[PDB]
Every structure is written in C-alpha cells, then in structure tokens.
Design a protein around this ligand. Structure first.
Ligand SMILES: *[C@@H]1O[C@H](CO)[C@@H](O[C@@H]2O[C@H](CO)[C@@H](O[C@@H]3O[C@H](CO)[C@@H](O)[C@H](O)[C@@H]3O)[C@H](O)[C@H]2NC(C)=O)[C@H](O)[C@H]1NC(C)=O
Ligand SMILES: *[C@@H]1O[C@H](CO)[C@@H](O[C@@H]2O[C@H](CO)[C@@H](O[C@@H]3O[C@H](CO)[C@@H](O)[C@H](O)[C@@H]3O)[C@H](O)[C@H]2NC(C)=O)[C@H](O)[C@H]1NC(C)=O
Ligand SMILES: *[C@@H]1O[C@H](CO)[C@@H](O[C@@H]2O[C@H](CO)[C@@H](O[C@@H]3O[C@H](CO)[C@@H](O)[C@H](O)[C@@H]3O)[C@H](O)[C@H]2NC(C)=O)[C@H](O)[C@H]1NC(C)=O
Ligand SMILES: *[C@@H]1O[C@H](CO)[C@@H](O)[C@H](O)[C@H]1NC(C)=O
Ligand SMILES: *[C@@H]1O[C@H](CO)[C@@H](O)[C@H](O)[C@H]1NC(C)=O
Ligand SMILES: [Fe+3]
Ligand SMILES: [Fe+3]
Lengths: 348, 348
C-alpha cells in the first residue's frame, strides 16, 4: 500500500484533497470526517494515514499514540536563508484581538463579553486563552466566563456555540470544520469583523493576512489594521505591529501526524509531494498548489513555505514543548473529552 | 529444451492445449495452473515457457522480467494489403455495458451498483474502469464502491466475489479461469445478460459477438443488441455502434510473453505453429484449430486472426504504452500483490 490516505476535515477540505490525489497519481488519497477528532480516529483505525494538525489536536492524537511527522513552516526574518526543510521553526503568536473603536475593553474586563474562538481544543483559539482565564480567575467555569461565544466544537445546544453562524443556509452551526462561517483562524477574526463578538483569539499572522487588500474576499477587502487592537496581559492595548510585545503566548506550529508504523513512509511521500506542489515546486501553480486555499486554510495554512523536519523522532511532548503540555494538561483537569478518556490508558 | 512448454490456465484451456500438443508433434507441450498469476510463476520457475495474456497481466509478467513475443491480431477494415503477421495492430476499445432497460444508470451513478468484471488485474475488466473510478473519487477504496461484484480473482470471501457462480457445481466460485461461469469477457457480459449485474466492463467486440445470433450458446442467442447501452465518460448513454465515441479507453492487444532468453525460439516455433493450425492453416479444421475455442477465448481470443510481429524488440512498457503503464502503477498503489512484491527483488 504505497498510497498515503490523507484525512480531510469537512467537504471543502475533501475537494482539495481529491484534487491532490489526482495530481499525485494516487501517491495520496482521501478520506474525510466532519471533525478533526473524528479524523484522528480514522488515523488510529488505520482507515487513514495522516493529516496536518494544530498543536492542541496534536496533544489529543499524541495521547492516542499518534506521533508528529513534519512541522508546517512559514516565512522568516531571523536566519532568513537556510533551506526551508532544515531551517528551525519559530513558532507563532497567539493574540487577543478587538475592534479599536470599542473602548473600555481589555484583558481585565473580558469577563462577560462575547468571544470568537478558532475552535475548541485548538491552541491560540482556545487552549492558551482559556488556559490563562482558568489560572487567573481560579475556577473551572470558563464555560460561563464569557457571556456568549463562537467556539466550534463545543456543545451546540450551549452558549459557546450561541454565536456560530453555520454555513450559507445556516446548517451545522458550531461543527468545527470550514463550512462554519466562523471556523478556525479566519472564521474567528471574521466573527470579530462583523461584530458578532467582542474579542477573538487568533494568531498575529491572521490579522495581517485579512486586512488591507491581502484577502480579496468579500468580507475582508475593506478591513483596516487601524480598526483593530491587541489586548496584552498588562491590562494594556497596542496596535497589531506590537504583537511581539502584545501576545498571549508562543504556539507550536501545525504539523503532520500519523501512526509510528506509518511515519517514515508518510514523511518521505510528503517531502516529494511538496517538491512537486509546494511553494516552489515543479507543478505549482502550473498544476496544483498544496499550500494555497484562497485564504481558507485547507489541509494546510496558506502561509506555509514547506513542511520541515523535526529534531530526531519526537513525540507530542518533545514536539509541543513541556511548558505547553502542562498548560494544556492543567486546563484539561477542568474538562473531559471522549478521546482523552478513551485513550488515557496508553499514556499512563 | 526445444519443446515449448505452454501455460494453460485452467482445465478447459488444458484440454485444448494438449490437443494442440498432440498435433504439434511435441514441438509444443503443456503445463497448467489454476490462474494466470500461477502460470506466470511457472514461467519464472521455468516449468513453462510462455502463454498469451491480456495487457494487464503483461504488466505483471513484465515486472517479473518476462517479455512480449508476438501480439494477437484480429480482422481489420483498413490497412488490409499486408499479411496478417506483418500488418500493424490496432488494439481494442474497452467499454462499460448496461442494459437499456435500467434507466438513469450512467457513469456517475455507478456507486453502490452491482458490477461484472473479466478479472482482477485485467485491462478492460479492471485496470481501466477501476483506475478511473479510483482517480475520479480520490479514494483507493474500490473494494467498497460497488454494492456487489463478480471480479474473478478477488478475495472470494469479499463482496467483489459475491456474485461469482463458480462451475456447474458452484465450486471454485471466483477463480479467474474459464471454469467460473462469469470469467473473462464472455462471462462478464453474460453476467450482465442474466441480470446478475447492472454494469459490465468488457470490450466493444464482446457485445457484437454475443448478440443477434452471434453466439449459438443458450444464454446468448436470443440476446438483442438494442436492449443494451454503453456508458460514456461525459455522463451519457450511446448505443453499441458508438463504441468509437463511447469507450473508456483503448487497450493494447494481448500478446504472448516469454522469458527473455526464450523469445526467438518461441517466436519461430509459434509462427510456424500458426501456419499450421491458425486461421488459414493446412490443418484447420481438418485436424486442429488454434484460434477457435467455441466462444470461450481459450489460450487465445476466438477472434484472433493471427499472431503478429512487433516493431523491433519492445519492453513490456513500450508494448503497453507509457500512458497505460501509468494508469496501472497508479491503481496498484492501492493493493499489493505478493507476486509483484516478490518480483521486485527476485528478478534479473
Ligand atoms: C509518485 O511517487 C513517486 C515517489 O515514489 C515519484 O516517482 C519518483 O520520482 C523520482 C523523481 O523525483 C524518480 O527519479 C529520480 O531521478 C533522479 C535523477 O534525475 C535521481 O536523482 C533519483 O534517484 C530518482 O531516480 C524516481 O525514480 C520515482 N520513483 C518511482 C517508483 O517512480 C512520483 O513523482 C510521484 N508522482 C506524483 C505525481 O506525485
Ligand atoms: C505578524 O504577521 C505578519 C504577517 O505574517 C508579519 O509580517 C510579515 O513580516 C515579514 C518579515 O518579518 C515580511 O517579509 C519581508 O519581506 C520583505 C520584502 O517585501 C523582505 O525585505 C524581508 O527580508 C522579509 O522577507 C512579510 O512581508 C510581512 N507580511 C505582511 C503581509 O506584512 C509580522 O512579522 C508578524 N509579527 C510578528 C510580531 O511576528
Ligand atoms: C466493434 O466490434 C465489432 C465486432 O468486433 C466490429 O464489427 C466488425 O467490423 C468489421 C469491419 O470493420 C467487419 O468485417 C467486414 O466484413 C465485410 C464482409 O462481411 C467486409 O466487406 C469488410 O471489408 C470487413 O472485413 C466484421 O464483420 C464486424 N463484425 C460484426 C460481428 O459485426 C466493429 O468494427 C467495432 N467497432 C468499433 C468502433 O471499433
Ligand atoms: C517440429 O520441428 C521442426 C521445426 O523446425 C520441423 O521439421 C517439424 O516439422 C516440426 N513439426 C511440427 C508438427 O510442427
Ligand atoms: C484523473 O487523472 C487524469 C490524468 O490521468 C486527469 O486528467 C483527470 O483530471 C483525473 N480525473 C478527473 C475527473 O479530473
Ligand atoms: Fe493553531
Ligand atoms: Fe483484455
């Protein structure tokens, strides 16, 4: 079985993956599920092989035995010309973000406001913010800390899904895939933009990429960096350029995961795949660009140069950073989920 | 070692083979196995010299070091000035056949239907439709695509063999030799004919040959060429006279393969043999007919006019054509053959 079956979360991702299968002559094939958690289960069953994952999902899969194959990697300023696949990863910034126009809203007045989150269990969208809010307030009731949210993946009869828009017909509110208008990085930021929420937790890179003519997408052509601000943990606010000084935390980059018995096959298949279709591969754009989704972030984030190598053969823990595994761990004392419970024994 | 050991797949191909041998004066003798894959093995062991094979099987043979020697040739219309043996080959049209009565069945509503196949690994029966399907669908899961099938050679427990009737007894259900009621071109079309299946993947030439009194077999004589249609890629349904505009692809002709050292000897031996027992041969039908098997396509297809020579010495790759060879490799990234796996290092 040479083919690497890839896991597409949601129908929009499934289409780009169907495309990739066709271009790759079945070097890659598609399986899908509605959610990432579901996909992780296919990867476990052996029904799929691999998929690229936010660091928080990496911890879920990590727990269930899956391991990290190659990290997503983006442009760089520091050391900005060693080869992409061997150049170390620099992480990204998880930020709290607001309309500038609104005032009196700051980290310390967040309680009882309205939130937009990438989706539940994700790193910047969720794990970091809710992480801190737990440590600070000192209670496990983050489900009630904000007045309402969009938090795809949460309980959809609950308040954390109260603000989610669903798709075009409004079907499937709160399903944590790209058919939910406010899903993921761009979803969240848009939930901010349309004033459905007060704060939105995202990465620095997400505001720059959807303001000031960078997206030519109806919801975001006219958006202006000026109209937004970043809450720091100071109590303070700064514009988006000071993100380095105004960020909640540093996050580990998305990364591909698979089963260990499938890691090397997958890593190799992918390295060739990116050479074919990656940022500067033979066939991109003449044929297929693996890293472009028109700002919809499918399979991969659109600002990925290449998938890069990892020091040794790490585990979720080496890969994520021991500092983060604890932040996630401690947040997770305040809530259970099917997959961590079902897999808890593997890692005891 | 002058005798040519001929590989006969199955007992019926066996009886014919020995009659040939008795006439041959032992210039030709027979081995047998249950399948075409086993027969190749025999050749690899050198317990047999050669046999005649569908292109798909030629791929397998080729991967195992074996080479093509001469190609089946059948009546043409154009180019009819040369001798059959020196007249270049055309190659067959591989096609999808449904009953006309079953309406709303098109290339695009095949999923979950019941299919008939010549055999796993064959060209029209398998490699073509199953390659296209796999490719269009982006999924290597062909084993779950038809609700049921008769794909002789597949795993007999599985649903690709659900519809296979075996011999008169009901024994050897799904073995890919002629004993299986639904084996080969003839059997796949019959499968459709007796409404065991909805679709059937054969070649244009099979349909003609078994409708409107073409075959005086009980199951075929009453068959009526109108009652049938062809599926085209566009999505439409032409009648069987539009094979030219409603075919899936163009198949290379079957050819004889042999171990490489033995090619010329087999070539010489066979050229003479046909002169004797071929179409116009001093001894057909007085003593023996090499290309006539009573509508069973034993050893060779019953429509074979002679065995032609081939421009130069070709690789199996050159014979099959770079494009078909790619289609196959790509489809085979979803399976494993123990045979191919073996050949991958066991061959000079
Ligand atoms: C599908 O997968 C295979 C990966 O197995 C790709 O085929 C392989 O591609 C390399 C090209 O990168 C082939 O040739 C190479 O040539 C250079 C010399 O110019 C040499 O440095 C290398 O050692 C190698 O020989 C390689 O043979 C080939 N392997 C096979 C089995 O075909 C293919 O590109 C992938 N196709 C798609 C569409 O992704
Ligand atoms: C927050 O995210 C934004 C966007 O991801 C970051 O801005 C980007 O910064 C890089 C360099 O740091 C820019 O690339 C540069 O391009 C010029 C040529 O135009 C070149 O001379 C430099 O050597 C470098 O390659 C990139 O264009 C820029 N993108 C945009 C749309 O502004 C920003 O750095 C991030 N902020 C923090 C604190 O990390
Ligand atoms: C699809 O397959 C059928 C059967 O294999 C093809 O029909 C066959 O066509 C050839 C000629 O093109 C026929 O031979 C002709 O016979 C007459 C005398 O009967 C002669 O005057 C011509 O010069 C020529 O030799 C053959 O009889 C015929 N067989 C049957 C049963 O109809 C058809 O050509 C194929 N279609 C496509 C698009 O390839
Ligand atoms: C078998 O051997 C040779 C071919 O060189 C020939 O003299 C003899 O006639 C052949 N016999 C038959 C029946 O093919
Ligand atoms: C299947 O592969 C072929 C190339 O072999 C490609 O042209 C085609 O796009 C693929 N199928 C579809 C429906 O595009
Ligand atoms: Fe993230
Ligand atoms: Fe064939």
């Amino acid at each position: 079985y040479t083919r690497v079956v890839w896991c597409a979360v949601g129908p929009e991702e499934q289409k780009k993956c169907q495309q990739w299968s066709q271009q790759s002559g079945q070097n890659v094939t598609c399986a899908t599920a509605s959610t990432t958690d579901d996909c992780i289960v296919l990867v476990l069953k052996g029904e799929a092989d691999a998929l690229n994952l936010d660091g928080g999902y990496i911890y879920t899969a990590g727990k269930c035995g899956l391991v990290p194959v190659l990290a997503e990697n983006r442009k760089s300023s520091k050391h900005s010309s060693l080869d992409c696949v061997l150049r170390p990863t620099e992480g990204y910034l998880a930020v709290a973000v607001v309309k500038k126009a609104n005032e009196g809203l700051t980290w310390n007045s967040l309680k009882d406001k309205k939130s937009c989150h990438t989706a539940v269990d994700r790193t910047a969208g969720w794990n970091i913010p809710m992480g801190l809010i737990v440590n600070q307030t000192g209670s496990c009731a983050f489900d009630e800390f904000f007045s309402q949210s969009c938090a795809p993946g949460a309980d959809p009869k609950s308040r954390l899904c109260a603000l989610c828009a669903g798709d075009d017909q409004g079907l499937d509110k709160c399903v944590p895939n790209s058919k939910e208008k406010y899903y993921g990085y761009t979803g969240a930021f848009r939930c901010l933009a349309e004033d459905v929420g007060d704060v939105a937790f995202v990465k620095n890179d997400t505001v720059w990429e959807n303001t000031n003519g960078e997206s030519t997408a109806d919801w975001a052509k006219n958006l202006k960096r000026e109209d937004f601000r970043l809450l720091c943990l100071d109590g303070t606010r700064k514009p988006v350029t000071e993100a380095q000084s105004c960020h909640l935390a540093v996050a580990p980059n998305h990364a591909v995961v698979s089963r260990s018995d499938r890691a090397a096959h997958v890593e190799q298949v992918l390295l060739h795949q990116q050479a074919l279709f990656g940022k500067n591969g033979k066939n991109c754009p003449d044929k297929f660009c693996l890293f472009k989704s028109e700002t919809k972030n499918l399979l991969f984030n659109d600002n990925t140069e290449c998938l890069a190598k990892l020091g040794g053969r790490p585990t979720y823990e080496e890969y994520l950073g021991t500092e983060y595994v604890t932040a996630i761990a401690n947040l997770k004392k305040c809530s259970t989920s099917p997959l961590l419970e079902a897999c808890a024994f593997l890692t005891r």
